[PDB]
Amino acid sequence: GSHMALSLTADQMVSALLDAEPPILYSEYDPTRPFSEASMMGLLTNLADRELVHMINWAKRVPGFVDLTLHDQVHLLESAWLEILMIGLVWRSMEHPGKLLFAPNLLLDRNQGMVEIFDMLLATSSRFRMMNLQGEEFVCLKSIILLNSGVYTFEEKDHIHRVLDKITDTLIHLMAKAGLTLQQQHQRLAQLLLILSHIRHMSNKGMEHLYSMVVPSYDLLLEMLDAHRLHA
Amino acid sequence: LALSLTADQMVSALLDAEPPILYSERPFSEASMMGLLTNLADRELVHMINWAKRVPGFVDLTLHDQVHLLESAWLEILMIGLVWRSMEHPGKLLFAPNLLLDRNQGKSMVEIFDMLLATSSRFRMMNLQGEEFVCLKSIILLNSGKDHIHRVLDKITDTLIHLMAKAGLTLQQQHQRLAQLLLILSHIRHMSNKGMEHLYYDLLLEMLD
Numbered sequence: 092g093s094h095m096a097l098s099l100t101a102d103q104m105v106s107a108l109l110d111a112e113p114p115i116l117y118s119e120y121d122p123t124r125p126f127s128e129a130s131m132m133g134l135l136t137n138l139a140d141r142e143l144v145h146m147i148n149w150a151k152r153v154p155g156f157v158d159l160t161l162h163d164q165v166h167l168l169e170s171a172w173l174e175i176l177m178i179g180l181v182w183r184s185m186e187h188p189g190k191l192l193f194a195p196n197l198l199l200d201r202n203q204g205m206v207e208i209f210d211m212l213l214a215t216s217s218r219f220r221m222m223n224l225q226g227e228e229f230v231c232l233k234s235i236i237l238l239n240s241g242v243y244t245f246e247e248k249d250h251i252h253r254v255l256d257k258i259t260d261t262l263i264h265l266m267a268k269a270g271l272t273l274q275q276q277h278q279r280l281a282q283l284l285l286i287l288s289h290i291r292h293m294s295n296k297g298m299e300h301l302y303s304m305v306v307p308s309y310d311l312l313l314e315m316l317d318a319h320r321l322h323a
Numbered sequence: 324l325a326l327s328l329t330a331d332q333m334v335s336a337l338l339d340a341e342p343p344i345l346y347s348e349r350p351f352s353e354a355s356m357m358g359l360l361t362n363l364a365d366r367e368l369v370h371m372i373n374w375a376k377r378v379p380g381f382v383d384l385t386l387h388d389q390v391h392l393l394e395s396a397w398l399e400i401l402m403i404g405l406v407w408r409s410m411e412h413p414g415k416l417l418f419a420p421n422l423l424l425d426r427n428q429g430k431s432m433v434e435i436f437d438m439l440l441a442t443s444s445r446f447r448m449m450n451l452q453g454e455e456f457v458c459l460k461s462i463i464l465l466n467s468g469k470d471h472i473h474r475v476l477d478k479i480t481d482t483l484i485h486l487m488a489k490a491g492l493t494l495q496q497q498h499q500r501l502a503q504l505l506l507i508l509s510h511i512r513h514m515s516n517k518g519m520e521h522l523y524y525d526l527l528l529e530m531l532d
């Protein structure tokens with residue numbers, strides 16, 4: 092059978108998101124690769140390209156996402172894809188202070204690293220470490236980025252907002268079970284959502300660089316989302 | 324000092340700090356609109372610096388941090404004001420009572436314009452209240468660019484929740500609304516960044532010092 096998004100309990104929501112999680116990918120094994128700007132950027136581009144395929148699979152499993160039209164799915168992914176890659180990056184890097192774990196075989200320190208955003212990404216990773224962000228909260232945040240980033244760059248909008256309310260209910264439940272008071276729940280929720288505005292900022296600066304050097308477009312993402320129908 | 328204030332006095336303080344609605348200087352053009360917008364922005368910025376000094380907790384920061392926050396937040400603060408003023412004018416942006424521009428006038432930017440209109444429509448649909456708006460504007464200033472800032476942000480969160488509880492929202496409705504409001508700040512950020520991209524201390528430092 093199929094659960095509709097708005098019917099899910101907090102436990103069913105977490106289970107759906109944990110199950111949908113993509114794998115941690117490795118960087119290309121290429122030891123003799125040269126050190127240049129275009130070289131490192133190439134490693135990152137190749138990694139991002141492969142993550143994007145898993146990202147589509149993940150997006151299709153975020154409750155409510157397939158309730159939208161293909162056109163609306165593409166708009167949301169086009170808005171969110173870099174923010175999603177970045178929150179993934181910051182999550183992976185939490186146990187490596189001062190470094191970004193692009194992949195288990197591509198752990199970069201500050202001197203190796205992108206001029207403005209590296210320190211921003213490190214700052215974000217530190218803040219999640221401080222707050223002791225849990226995996227269950229992380230998957231909720233990532234789903235929020237997907238549903239929210241493109242909603243006001245666009246009944247059907249109402250549905251997205253009701254799904255977002257469901258994810259918020261799920262976050263609150265996790266925080267209540269963790270032993271936070273009503274007031275602490277509200278403060279921690281607020282802190283997390285303000286960090287999302289920083290991730291948006293980082294994505295914007297990231298995109299500016301990418302457009303000045305093509306980059307994932309409406310048309311690529313439309314093809315990839317549609318191509319999902321043909322997978323195993 | 325902010326940490327000692329009640330939720331009601333926070334609200335009162337923020338409402339008292341609010342800056343005035345300014346006027347723009349017959350039909351328009353490109354540079355006519357842009358010069359009018361720049362002149363208005365310049366004048367709004369002076370009032371914004373005076374507003375920030377009255378946001379409880381802001382003047383306790385170092386002058387270096389005050390400058391950094393205002394440099395980071397100024398376009399977001401001008402946009403959230405604009406969107407707030409435009410709430411009751413579907414499909415138009417109320418830059419000033421004498422400067423109300425529809426979508427097609429936006430072409431005289433129309434990327435940014437449509438994004439602003441979408442924000443205004445969202446606030447309308449949510450029935451954003453004045454007491455909530457001033458809390459959001461303060462969050463924008465404090466979050467733009469350090470435990471003291473975090474302490475005040477937690478206080479503003481408490482104050483938002485206090486306002487919702489007083490309006491009779493259930494405990495569930497309280498967290499849902501808080502999230503709805505704070506999610507809009509990601510979009511205000513995005514809009515500010517697109518504006519800054521199109522557009523590309525003395526004033527700040529004089530007024531703040």
Ligand SMILES: CC/C(=C(\c1ccccc1)c1ccc(/C=C/C(=O)O)cc1)c1ccccc1
Pocket residue numbers: 132135136138139142176177180193205208297298300301305306307
């Ligand atoms: C934040 C790091 C990063 C990535 C990246 C993030 C997470 C995982 C893998 C890579 C990035 C780099 C290039 C691209 C894609 C370029 C392209 O497709 O032309 C996408 C993302 C990036 C993004 C923009 C500018 C500089 C670096």
Ligand SMILES: CC/C(=C(\c1ccccc1)c1ccc(/C=C/C(=O)O)cc1)c1ccccc1
Pocket residue numbers: 360361363364367401402405418432435517518519521522
């Ligand atoms: C979104 C409206 C806007 C404003 C503006 C916002 C609120 C109130 C009045 C004007 C804006 C326009 C020009 C400036 C120029 C500043 C400068 O030249 O130093 C600043 C803000 C703008 C901002 C960036 C690009 C195009 C238009």
